[PDB]
UniProtKB/TrEMBL annotation, chain A:
Alphabetical GO biological process terms: dTMP biosynthetic process; methylation
Portion held of the full protein: 51 to 333 of 337
Catalytic activity: dUMP + (6R)-5,10-methylene-5,6,7,8-tetrahydrofolate = 7,8-dihydrofolate + dTMP
Molecular function GO labels: thymidylate synthase activity
Residues at the active site: C169
Enzyme Commission designation: 2.1.1.45
Pathway assigned in UniProt: Pyrimidine metabolism; dTTP biosynthesis
Keyword Transferase: yes
Protein name as catalogued: Thymidylate synthase
Quaternary data: Homodimer.
Membrane listed as a keyword: no
Domain Thymidylate synthase/dCMP hydroxymethylase: 6-283
Organism: Human herpesvirus 8 (HHV-8)
Amino acid sequence: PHEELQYLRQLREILCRGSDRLDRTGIGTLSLFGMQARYSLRDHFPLLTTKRVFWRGVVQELLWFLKGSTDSRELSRTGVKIWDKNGSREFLAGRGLAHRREGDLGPVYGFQWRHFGAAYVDADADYTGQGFDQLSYIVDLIKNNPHDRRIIMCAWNPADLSLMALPPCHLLCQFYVADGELSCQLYQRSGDMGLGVPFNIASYSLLTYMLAHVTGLRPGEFIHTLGDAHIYKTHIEPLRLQLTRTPRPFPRLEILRSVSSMEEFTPDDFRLVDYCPHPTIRM
Amino acid sequence: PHEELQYLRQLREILCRGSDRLDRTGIGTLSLFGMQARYSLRDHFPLLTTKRVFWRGVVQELLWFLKGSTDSRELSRTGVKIWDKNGSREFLAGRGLAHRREGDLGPVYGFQWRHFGAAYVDADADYTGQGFDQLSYIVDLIKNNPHDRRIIMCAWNPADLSLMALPPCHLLCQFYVADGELSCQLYQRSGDMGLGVPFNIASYSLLTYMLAHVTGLRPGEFIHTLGDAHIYKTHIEPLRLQLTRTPRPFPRLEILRSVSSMEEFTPDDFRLVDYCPHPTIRME
């Protein structure tokens, strides 16, 4: 069976028996708690096909985080605008962080991944040698102690939450090596099933391809674990449309160059082969 | 189907198609990566029955960590010795922590839960007001913002790993409120299927009962998610024995008085009703 049917079955389950809840800000969702799906990375790349996923954004966003940036303006300069709302002075003001220049997202993914536990100043500060470099940590383990059970990169630092533009939805990823293959499990505390989750699956599957490439392994499996899996009520109609569509064969992902470090990738290193999605769906 | 069959199925799957791998310890395991099981908490308590689980240790250990302790001697004094080997001066020296007094585990669960991000000194230091109190954080959300999607307690701080007697296997728990019920998901990076996982299920199910009680909710479900789920090769024969056993109906758990704060529970407050397990299975 097509692995995309896991995601579609998750949508169906939430629509059928999801709890209807309002939060303190007055917005309603349907949700279920606790889900898991598995996507093979071996012969294909799991970029969903029942709608067109924003691959250009997936790639630029991940490279942006990997270099430790917390500046939405540097992502925006690449042509990808998905963090620009969160980096705006008016958004930051709304957060209670008015003391900032446009673009300064606070200690979000890039900072946590490369400098966990360091003292955040701003998005222009030099944090070289400060904090715990989780990316270097996991690359070393995959290379030199691949069977280790602590190959973890974590983005959740509760002491830093009040400084973040947004708290991370992707709390941590764990990696696993067996029989020459690298697998990844993501724990996602909150899954916006309509707008986010297809993009999220692509992000961590890409991360796994990159890590496998750098470490001389082949991609194995991506295990997607969800906490609060939800559908915003305004997304139900477009998702009803999506659910009428039959999945097409997943594309393949090729890496065009020998790359020795997780920091040396560029967007043009990635060749996506035979991606033929159904049309974009605006949620 | 009896919910304990999930755990037994996971054992069978690991034995059948688990990867045979050695660690840096040289000790071999069979393992699989990525599992999930669900245990209802509404009408029973999922204390496993195909072997006798150490309930008294479950209760004492959880209460010890909730109060923020990192002192294995404080647990030992209650009569529960499960952390004594890790808190011994011998083990700690083996870890490169030879300056520690006996019992000083470093910034393990108790410290992370109550003082995340604070600078660890030793097990005797007063950390009042230091770090992020995640226990107070989640209790406040469950009470006042129950549909929030950030009800999380996390024990993984990579910056503190070198100071810990042992790295935590239980990385985080997330809570969820619906229909007057409190549910919990545990992300466990490493599951010792033989010695640890039945005990682990009980720990976080108990935590969920306690939280539900303090916040005026009923317990819902416990969702157990595993990363590296493994069987130690020295555990193969005792687990093959366990697999020949049929689960008995789960016990029930009663809380015997009104408790208004997580820090106020004592082991006196819990009554396990109709626990009828198969005999204890010892494992190396």
